[PDB]
Design a protein around this ligand. Structure first.
Ligand SMILES: CCCCCCCCCCCCCCCCCC(=O)OC[C@H](COP(=O)([O-])OCC(O)COP(=O)([O-])OC[C@@H](COC(=O)CCCCCCCCCCCCCCCCC)OC(=O)CCCCCCCCCCCCCCCCC)OC(=O)CCCCCCCCCCCCCCCCC
Ligand code: BCL
Ligand code: BCL
Ligand SMILES: CC[C@H]1c2cc3[nH]c4c(c3C)C(=O)[C@H](C(=O)OC)c4c3nc(cc4[nH]c(cc(n2)[C@@H]1C)c(C(C)=O)c4C)[C@@H](C)[C@@H]3CCC(=O)OC/C=C(\C)CCC[C@H](C)CCC[C@H](C)CCCC(C)C
Ligand SMILES: CC[C@H]1c2cc3[nH]c4c(c3C)C(=O)[C@H](C(=O)OC)c4c3nc(cc4[nH]c(cc(n2)[C@@H]1C)c(C(C)=O)c4C)[C@@H](C)[C@@H]3CCC(=O)OC/C=C(\C)CCC[C@H](C)CCC[C@H](C)CCCC(C)C
Ligand SMILES: CC(C)=CCC/C(C)=C/CC/C(C)=C/CC/C(C)=C/CC/C(C)=C/CC/C(C)=C\CC/C(C)=C/CC/C(C)=C/CC1=C(C)C(=O)c2ccccc2C1=O
Ligand SMILES: CCCCCC/C=C\CCCCCCCCCC(=O)O[C@H](COC(=O)CCCCCCCCCCCCCCC)COP(=O)(O)OC[C@@H](O)CO
Ligand SMILES: COC(C)(C)C/C=C/C(C)=C/C=C/C(C)=C/C=C/C(C)=C/C=C\C=C(C)\C=C\C=C(C)\C=C\C=C(C)\C=C\CC(C)(C)OC
Ligand code: HEM
Ligand code: HEM
Ligand SMILES: CCCCCCCCCCCCO[C@@H]1O[C@H](CO)[C@@H](O[C@H]2O[C@H](CO)[C@@H](O)[C@H](O)[C@H]2O)[C@H](O)[C@H]1O
Ligand SMILES: [Ca+2]
Ligand SMILES: [Ca+2]
Ligand SMILES: [Fe+3]
Ligand SMILES: [Mg+2]
Lengths: 259, 318, 43, 311, 277, 59, 63, 50
């Protein structure tokens, strides 16, 4: 054997071409894996064709893979058929690609940044089968680190600076110990609502929790929990999505543009 | 500003988690777990416990022997002067056998120690690979990590063992030293005509660059949707939440296409793995089937031509 | 002696000891092969 | 830490990044440390000849006495200004060769005359002068001897590398490239000149030795590798600069200086002018250049002294 | 066409500039003001590169070989002024278009982030890559005093630029910031392979097993290296490693020539000349 | 005259730690800088008429 | 009645913003003078460039 | 000073003792290293006595 395959072809040239064929197959494989969610696409192409043309692009979809959930929570198929969901919005113009304007109060529309899918109405579970996100009042073995302030008792302040409530309890993740939610006693109504840690900016000196997402008045409409001591995956999405809607809807100037 | 979720503001303490129970007959995990406040600021506070089984013990014993041999020879290279050892530490190295020894075992200070350090380090790395395989197996997990580690080991073996054997010379192998192995890296490229023109070196860089690009993309993406629980990617894979949807929708709006919460980790896995796969191939092709990479590029029309504004009379053409 | 197995696990001790002995045995053979005076695979 | 901008000299095509970068203040200090000596006023025409007057003149025979005296005054400033004529002469006796410095300096005259007359491929009408190396010191500041490297245990064979050395510009490369390449004539080229393997069995280690020599060359001239190379193809002369051709002759010129002028003088030289291996203080790059692309930044001193050229 | 769950997210507003003028989608892409600006910045820059390839360095050397196409910066003699189009001026125009396209891409990402109500980590992270490019073609050339110090626009020609810039310091591996940046690049790749492996091995376990848990994830790397950073923190670490690699790479090149002109190994002489040894 | 009020703002244990650490580092740094010079290296300047092999001129 | 800037910009941000901008601008201008050899005061009041003679050139030949 | 003892109400002697001992040891090591690196004051390599 030798390095020269022909007068021009050599082993290194063959090796690099061999990689291109493998890499092409790898990209096709990866794109097919990418398409296990959200495909076939929601398209006008399908709509005018009466559903006779499924928009998948290239490569086409893969055969459904099986996710067996722990604790007999069920089995999900990664490529799955999903029922169409109506949107609480209307197009701002009739051309394709035009955005939609939410209907009613945008913070309550469940559209745009306030939209969320309906997840399972079951709590995420620890390896031992207990609910994962729970208040500190039921996860008695958990505690706040000594060097960090206790969130409980802190004043919750909305985006406008007005006081929204106080922190009654802290919800922790029992698998990876960390704060995920802050239970707020709303100043107006008194009904407890959850506040995700991702929307909470701590002011350690002032003992204040600043929520730039929504105003103090918006806290009254935060989606509530069925059971007081646990939260389902469905409820988690509903709560987080509501605060996210405030990043665009809470104040009129947040819609933009800047100039 | 809004909470960027870079540092944990308020840390939570629980009893140390012993870990998921191992199959019956396995050795217990060692180390009483402790909590580090500063580790918990950026990540998890718990340090330990660790599983140190039979395979890990052998890897440590083999690994220390290789490391001790390297450090001893570095100290010997400065004639036992520990002060000069510290001054020159970055420049010191255990250097491979001389070219005239071929693949034979040379005397200790002429490459013999290097071969022992190379063998013992290779054994410890191989034993560590078995440990990563066993740890995944003991937890009922798939062997993605051990495959990715094997790809890195393939590159490591190509550098110090497979290429030297194919060239029939231990002198082709990498010195055990900080600046010495950088000198080897530069000299390798110089010796074989500018490794920039090795297409598998080009590919390795594209995947190394892509690894940083993808982890920056994916790391920023998860942090951007961690306000929705995007960090809990198992939940988002089995039960697609708004975090996965917004993550995919962001990238679809940005660049016209997107991954899923699971498939992004397949892109990540392959990008990192291909970095060392193509690196190994490029090394194995160099000096064996290609002598001068730049001249190979000229033959295949890869190297650009520049206008001749400067040139040298060749003294050998006299 | 006999109590050395009361504070040392027999399993961890044996694999560690055999690991050291195997590494030590390899090291001595390697050193002898490195020595021209004791390389038994020469002429 | 240096302050930008540097003075940049482009030597290649735009975008190829073949450039020399000079810190203006570092360049200023180097120039002030490499200033030439002003030439003596030209000697009066005519007069008695060297051969008629002087007995033991074996090299500068074709000189007039006025020019010969001018040369002795010049070399005194160039070599031994703090010691005077008696550094190379027995006191009272001008023609006596009973001191080693006279035997050496006579051979040094031949070294200079041969360089200025037969090595113009390198020194190119600028030539050299005893000042170019000595700079007013009897011992040139930048000389080299065969380096044993750092001390090693008696049972350890030295690697000759993996040790921070200014000789290779503080890298871990083989720290003694002078001996194989500037005294001996070991092959510097390591790069194969075919795309596919065709018998070049040069080891990777030999590339480190060449890299060490080029580190010393670049430090000696105060330039970077692109002064003579397009680094995309180090081997290729077509993509190199004209200075690479000059450096090629300079290497052979240095080998001739060390093998044919310095080495045969070893017995005359005292032990203080010898290295641990017993080899004499030898000439390399930086003996003339001293960190500059041209010695004394191209100052032209030799042209004013006819004694420095072969008859 | 949108993802099957995407329609409920295609909301009006969130633009930085433009309001409703360009607030629409073209296929999958969101356009906005900076989609229009970015697209025609890229389109012009791409067409000028093709035009630069059409005339080449000269008519004799002109090539459409994708490896050999090269749009070169001006000669250093042009300083920081504008060069003629065929003498590096085209490179200067393409560089301006590239900056316009890259920044518009980042700003379009900001508008998308506002629409979706997510953190701005992605555009912030992309700014580091843009900053590295700006250092290479703007900051460093200005510090050196000539636009010709920028790298040429060519798939292989800019490797020749990298090679020669590296050998302008005789051994570029000894650059301390370069060493730090490579360490971050190498560690990031290792962390990415580890994170990709762990997620895949947990969600695609051995046959006959259910999907694993976050407890398995922490246990796995605790069993291997005695520490688990956590599901959230690995993304902090991956972002940190990738951003630190680019930051230190930008530092390493901007100190190579503007703030250091010697060989890089010589820089370590501060440590070698410490009076302790 | 009323400068004692500063430790009402700063813990006077940490300041004592800071000033010692800063002064020590500053003292060592100034000594290193002097040792790095030929003029003020008090150990290798010849005075008081120092009393201490072939040489390697290039290294 | 020029207070209105303080009803639309926080005193604290502007004062820190002004200080950072002014310090950066002053550093920038000081550097620009150091960039110019005519205004480089770090060279000394009685700074004289080295005299070049006998065919000396500070820089090697360019392109 | 006649009232210096009041420092120890602010610094715990445990931390002071460790810091003092660790710093002095490194200082003594550093000074010995500095002397050994000089030809004049390297007492091991100077050739005296004999
Ligand atoms: C080793 C590393 C390097 C290797 C080489 C790398 C080389 C560089 C790579 C560059 C990649 C650039 C392309 C990226 C995507 C382009 C944008 C896009 O449209 O995507 C849609 C495209 C297909 O989308 P789909 O989901 O199948 O579409 C569904 C239907 O088609 C939807 O049906 P539809 O009806 O919408 O179909 C139409 C659709 C069809 O889309 C396409 O055909 C475009 C794709 C062609 C390629 O049209 C579009 O998508 C674009 C619409 C544009 C409208 C405006 C037109 C203006 C022109 C008018 C001017 C008139 C004057 O997605 C991709 O192609 C993804 C490519 C991924 C490449 C990654 C591999 C390279 C990186 C490897 C490193 C990573 C580590 C690996 C381990
Ligand atoms: C001068 C050089 C000579 C040479 C001189 C010697 C000398 C001297 C010795 C050896 C020893 C050995 N030589 Mg020899 N040997 C040479 C060439 C070779 C070559 C070869 C291909 O050239 C090989 C493969 C070997 C191989 C061996 C091994 C069989 C043995 C080391 C085992 C060990 O390290 O256990 C350590 C690793 C372990 C895991 C130990 C535990 C063993 C098991 C797990 C316990 C079982 C208990 C059992 C009931 C009791 C019997 C013990 C048995 C070893 C199994 N030699 C050359 C020709 N060789 C050593 C020996 O004889 O040891 C037995 C020894 O002292
Ligand atoms: C080239 C000829 C001269 C020279 C020509 C000039 C000229 C002309 C000028 C100066 C000016 C200055 N020169 Mg000068 N200067 C020279 C050499 C020097 C040298 C030196 C050792 O070589 C030094 C140290 C200086 C230093 C100075 C400063 C005293 C001054 C810049 C003011 C400033 O930065 O405010 C900016 C920084 C501030 C902090 C401003 C404070 C105001 C704000 C509102 C405070 C907000 C506080 C808030 C907390 C924010 C804090 C900052 C952030 C936290 C980061 N010059 C050479 C020798 N120099 C300027 C001057 O006089 O300014 C008064 C000026 O016009
Ligand atoms: C996808 C390619 C990238 C990659 C992947 C990769 N690396 C990997 C893996 C993977 C997938 C692993 O699974 C494996 C791992 O364990 O990661 C955490 C590993 C690993 N990659 C590592 C390093 C590494 N990877 C690198 C690169 C890369 N790794 C690529 C960029 C590099 C570079 C860039 O140079 C390095 C340096 C290790 C951290 C680890 C493999 C560890 C290993 O093999 O250990 C062997 C052990 C020794 C040599 C030392 C043992 C001796 C001790 C020092 C003795 C003294 C102390 C003792 C332990 C005290 C305790 C004793 C007890 C008895 C009490
Ligand atoms: C900072 C950490 C890493 C990183 C991060 C990062 N990159 C990013 C992002 C992030 C977070 C994005 O959000 C953004 C994106 O959307 O990615 C999909 C992006 C991106 N990073 C990209 C590439 C990229 N990133 C790189 C590097 C990195 N990106 C870092 C390692 C590299 C390297 C190392 O080479 C490349 C090539 C794109 C895929 C994308 C940005 C796309 C964009 O800006 O689109 C607008 C512009 C065009 C469509 C074309 C413009 C053409 C010009 C007008 C002319 C050409 C000019 C150019 C200088 C030519 C040079 C050619 C030669 C060099 C061959
Ligand atoms: C009016 C009119 C016609 C106007 C013109 C049309 C206009 C303006 C369009 C605007 C858009 C513009 C300007 C288009 C022109 C320029 C073009 C064509 C750009 C194409 C887009 C582009 C640059 C693509 C390059 C992509 C490449 C090559 C590399 C990107 C990196 C890479 C390999 C990504 C693959 C992996 C993916 C998909 C990562 C994204 C991703 C990550 C990182 C997650 O973490 C994640 C987590 C959970 C769910 C999903 C995801 C996810 O999808
Ligand atoms: C190692 C230091 C931590 C440590 O030592 O923790 C050990 C855990 O086990 C162990 O080996 C664990 C061994 C691995 C611990 C080190 C892992 C890296 C350190 C944490 C890094 C955090 C940040 C990572 C990068 C983002 C405990 O061992 P013991 O001595 O039994 O207990 C001593 C303590 O109880 C204190 O009295
Ligand atoms: C605690 O430790 C103490 C203090 C006791 C000693 C410590 C010393 C220290 C600090 C050592 C530091 C060492 C350093 C910094 C090392 C750096 C090493 C680097 C950067 C190495 C980089 C690359 C090296 C490579 C890639 C080498 C690969 C070699 C291989 C794969 C060789 C394999 C060789 C084999 C398998 C030999 C085969 C031949 C057989 C037949 C055995 O030969 C007889
Ligand atoms: C004609 C002008 C020159 C004269 C008169 C001259 C004179 C001398 C003398 C007298 C010595 C011995 C000094 C001593 O050992 O004390 C000597 C040595 C030496 N010269 Fe020159 N020299 C001249 C030119 C050169 C040049 C051009 C070079 C460089 C190429 C050079 C390099 C050396 C070297 C390396 C030594 C050995 C070191 C030493 O012994 O001092 N000399 N020269
Ligand atoms: C540190 C930067 C430098 C590097 C990395 C470098 C690298 C090399 C290499 C690898 C070779 C061997 C070429 C082959 O195998 O065919 C070589 C030869 C050569 N280099 Fe350099 N070099 C550098 C600096 C210089 C400089 C500054 C000059 C000019 C003063 C120079 C002049 C030469 C010459 C003339 C040869 C050919 C020698 C011969 O064939 O005998 N180099 N260089
Ligand atoms: C380029 C990337 C984006 C950055 C945007 C800014 C681009 C450059 C700013 C424009 C500055 C133009 O400034 C102008 O430059 C040209 C070209 O050097 C100068 O021209 C001057 O130098 C050039 C070459 O150095 C000589 O050929 C010419 O004889 C001389 O007049 C003009 O004297 C100057 O007025
Ligand atoms: Ca003294
Ligand atoms: Ca003594
Ligand atoms: Fe992830
Ligand atoms: Mg070496």
């Amino acid at each position: 054997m030798s390095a020269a395959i022909t007068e021009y072809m050599d082993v290194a040239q063959l090796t690099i071409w061999a990689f291109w064929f493998f890499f092409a197959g790898l990209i096709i494989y990866l794109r097919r894996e990418d398409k296990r969610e959200g495909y076939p696409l929601d398209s006008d192409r399908t709509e005018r064709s009466g559903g006779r043309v499924k928009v998948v692009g290239f490569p086409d979809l893969a055969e459904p893979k099986t996710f067996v959930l722990p604790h007999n929570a069920g089995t999900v198929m990664a490529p799955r058929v999903e029922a169409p969901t109506s949107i609480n919005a209307t197009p701002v113009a009739p051309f394709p690609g035009a955005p939609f304007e939410p209907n009613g109060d945008p913070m309550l529309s469940g559209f745009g940044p306030s939209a969320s899918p309906d997840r399972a109405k079951h709590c995420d579970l620890t390896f031992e089968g207990l609910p994962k996100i729970v208040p500190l009042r039921v996860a008695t073995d958990f505690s706040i680190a000594e060097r960090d302030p206790d969130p409980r008792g802190m004043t919750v302040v909305g985006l406008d600076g007005e006081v929204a409530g106080t922190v009654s309890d802290v919800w922790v993740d029992r698998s990876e110990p960390q704060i995920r939610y802050l239970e707020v006693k709303v100043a107006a109504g008194g009904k407890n609502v959850l506040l995700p840690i991702g929307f909470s900016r701590f002011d350690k000196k002032a003992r204040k929790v600043k929520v730039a997402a929504i105003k103090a008045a918006h806290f009254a409409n935060v989606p509530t929990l069925a059971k007081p001591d646990q939260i389902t995956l469905y409820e988690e999405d509903k709560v987080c999505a509501y605060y996210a809607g405030g990043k665009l809807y809470a104040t009129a100037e947040r819609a933009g543009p800047l100039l | 500003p809004e909470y960027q979720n870079i540092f944990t503001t308020v840390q939570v303490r629980a009893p140390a988690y012993p870990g998921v129970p191992l199959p019956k007959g396995s050795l217990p995990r060692i180390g009483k777990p402790i909590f580090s406040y500063w580790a918990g600021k950026i990540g998890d506070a718990q340090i330990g416990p660790i599983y140190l089984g039979f395979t890990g013990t052998l890897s440590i014993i083999f690994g220390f022997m290789a490391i001790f041999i390297i450090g001893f020879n570095m100290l010997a290279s400065v004639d036992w002067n520990i002060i000069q050892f510290v001054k020159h530490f970055f420049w010191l190295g255990l250097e491979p056998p001389a070219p005239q020894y071929g693949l034979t075992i040379p005397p200790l200070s002429e490459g013999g120690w290097w071969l022992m350090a190379g063998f013992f380090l290779t054994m410890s790395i191989l034993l560590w690979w078995v440990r990563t395989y066993k740890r995944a197996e003991a937890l009922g997990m798939s062997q993605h990590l051990s495959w990715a580690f094997a790809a890195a080991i393939f590159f490591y073996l190509s550098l110090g063992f497979i290429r030297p054997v194919m060239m029939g010379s231990w002198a082709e192998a990498v010195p055990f030293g900080i600046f010495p192995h950088l000198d080897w890296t530069a000299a390798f490229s110089i010796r074989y005509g500018n490794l920039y023109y090795n297409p598998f070196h080009m590919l390795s860089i594209a995947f190394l660059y892509g690894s940083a690009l993808l982890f920056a993309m994916h790391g920023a993406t998860i942090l951007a949707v961690s306000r929705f629980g995007g960090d809990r990617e198992i939940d988002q894979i089995t039960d697609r939440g708004t975090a996965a949807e917004r993550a995919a929708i962001f990238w679809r709006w940005t660049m016209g296409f997107n991954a899923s919460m699971e498939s992004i980790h397949r892109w990540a896995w392959w990008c990192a793995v291909l970095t060392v796969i193509t690196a190994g191939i490029g090394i194995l092709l160099t000096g064996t089937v290609v002598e001068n990479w730049y001249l190979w590029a000229i033959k295949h029309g890869v190297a650009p031509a520049y206008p001749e504004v400067v040139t040298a009379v060749d003294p050998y053409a006299t | 002696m006999h109590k050395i197995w009361q504070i040392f696990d027999p399993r961890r001790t044996l694999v560690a000891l055999f690991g050291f002995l195997f590494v030590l045995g390899l090291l001595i053979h390697f050193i002898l092969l490195s020595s021209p005076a004791f390389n038994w695979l020469s002429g | 830490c240096e302050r930008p901008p540097p003075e940049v000299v482009q030597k290649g095509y735009r975008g190829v990044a073949m450039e020399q970068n000079y810190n203006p203040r570092l360049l200023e200090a180097s120039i002030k440390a490499n200033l030439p000596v002003e030439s003596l006023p030209a000697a009066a025409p005519g007069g008695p000849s060297v051969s008629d007057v002087y007995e033991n003149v074996q090299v500068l025979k074709d000189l007039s006495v006025a020019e010969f005296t001018r040369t002795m005054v010049a070399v005194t400033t160039w070599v031994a200004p703090k010691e005077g004529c008696n550094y190379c002469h027995v006191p009272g006796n001008w023609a006596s060769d009973d001191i080693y410095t006279k035997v050496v300096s006579r051979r040094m005259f031949e070294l200079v005359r041969a360089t200025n007359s037969n090595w113009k491929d390198h020194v190119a009408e600028t030539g050299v002068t005893c000042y170019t190396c000595h700079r007013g010191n009897p011992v040139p500041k930048y000389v080299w001897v065969t380096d044993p490297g750092p001390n090693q245990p008696s049972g350890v064979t030295p690697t000759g590398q993996n040790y921070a050395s200014s000789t290779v510009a503080y890298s871990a490369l083989p720290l003694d490239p002078y001996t194989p390449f500037l005294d001996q004539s070991n092959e510097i080229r390591v790069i194969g000149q075919t795309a596919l393997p065709a018998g070049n069995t040069t080891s990777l280690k030999q590339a480190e030795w060449t890299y060490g020599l080029m580190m010393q060359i670049s430090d000696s001239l105060g330039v970077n590798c692109t002064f003579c190379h397009n680094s995309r193809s180090f081997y290729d002369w077509k993509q190199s600069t004209p200075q690479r051709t000059t450096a090629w002759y300079a290497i052979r010129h240095v080998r001739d200086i060390n093998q044919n002028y310095i080495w045969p003088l070893n017995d005359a030289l005292p032990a203080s002018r010898k290295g641990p291996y017993g080899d004499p203080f030898k000439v390399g790059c930086m003996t003339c250049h001293q960190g500059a692309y041209k010695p004394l930044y191209g100052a032209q001193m030799a042209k004013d002294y006819p004694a420095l050229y072969e008859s | 066409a949108m993802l099957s769950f995407e329609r409920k997210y295609r909301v009006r507003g969130g633009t930085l500039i433009g309001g409703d003028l360009f607030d629409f989608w073209v296929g999958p892409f969101y356009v906005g003001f900076f989609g229009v600006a970015g697209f025609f910045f890229a389109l012009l820059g791409v067409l000028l590169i093709v035009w630069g390839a059409t005339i080449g360095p000269n008519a004799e050397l002109q090539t459409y070989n994708i490896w050999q196409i090269s749009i070169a910066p001006p000669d250093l003699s042009y300083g920081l002024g504008m060069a003629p189009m065929t003498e590096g001026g085209l490179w200067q125009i393409i560089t301006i278009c590239a900056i316009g396209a890259f920044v518009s891409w980042a700003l379009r990402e900001v508008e998308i982030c506002r629409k979706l109500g997510i953190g701005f980590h992605i555009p912030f992270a992309f700014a580091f890559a843009i900053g590295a490019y700006l250092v290479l073609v703007v900051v460093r050339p200005i510090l050196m005093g000539a636009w010709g110090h920028g790298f040429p626009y060519g798939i292989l020609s800019h490797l020749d630029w990298v090679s020669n810039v590296g050998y302008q310091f005789l051994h570029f591996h000894y650059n301390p910031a370069h060493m730090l940046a490579i360490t971050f690049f190498f560690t990031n790749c290792l962390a990415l392979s580890m994170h990709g492996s762990l997620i895949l091995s947990v969600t695609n376990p051995q046959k006959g097993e259910e999907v694993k848990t976050s407890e398995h994830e922490n246990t796995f790397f605790r069993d291997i290296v005695g520490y688990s950073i956590g599901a959230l923190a690995i993304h902090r670490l991956g972002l940190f490693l990738a951003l630190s690699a680019v930051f230190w790479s930008a530092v390493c090149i901007v100190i190579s020539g503007p703030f250091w002109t010697r060989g890089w190994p010589e820089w370590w002489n501060w440590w070698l000349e410490l009076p302790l040894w | 005259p009323d400068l004692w009020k500063i430790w009402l703002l700063v813990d006077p244990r940490r300041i004592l730690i800071a000033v010692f650490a800063f002064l020590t580092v500053l003292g060592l740094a100034i000594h290193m800088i002097l040792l790095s010079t030929a003029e003020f290296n008090w150990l290798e300047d010849g005075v008081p008429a120092a009393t201490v092999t072939p040489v390697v001129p290039q290294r | 009645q020029l207070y209105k800037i303080w009803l639309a910009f926080d005193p604290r941000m502007a004062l820190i913003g002004l200080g950072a901008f002014l310090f950066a601008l002053a550093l920038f201008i000081h550097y620009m003078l150091l960039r110019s050899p005519e205004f480089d005061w770090l060279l000394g009041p009685d700074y004289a460039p080295v005299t070049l003679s006998a065919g000396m050139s500070a820089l090697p030949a360019g392109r």
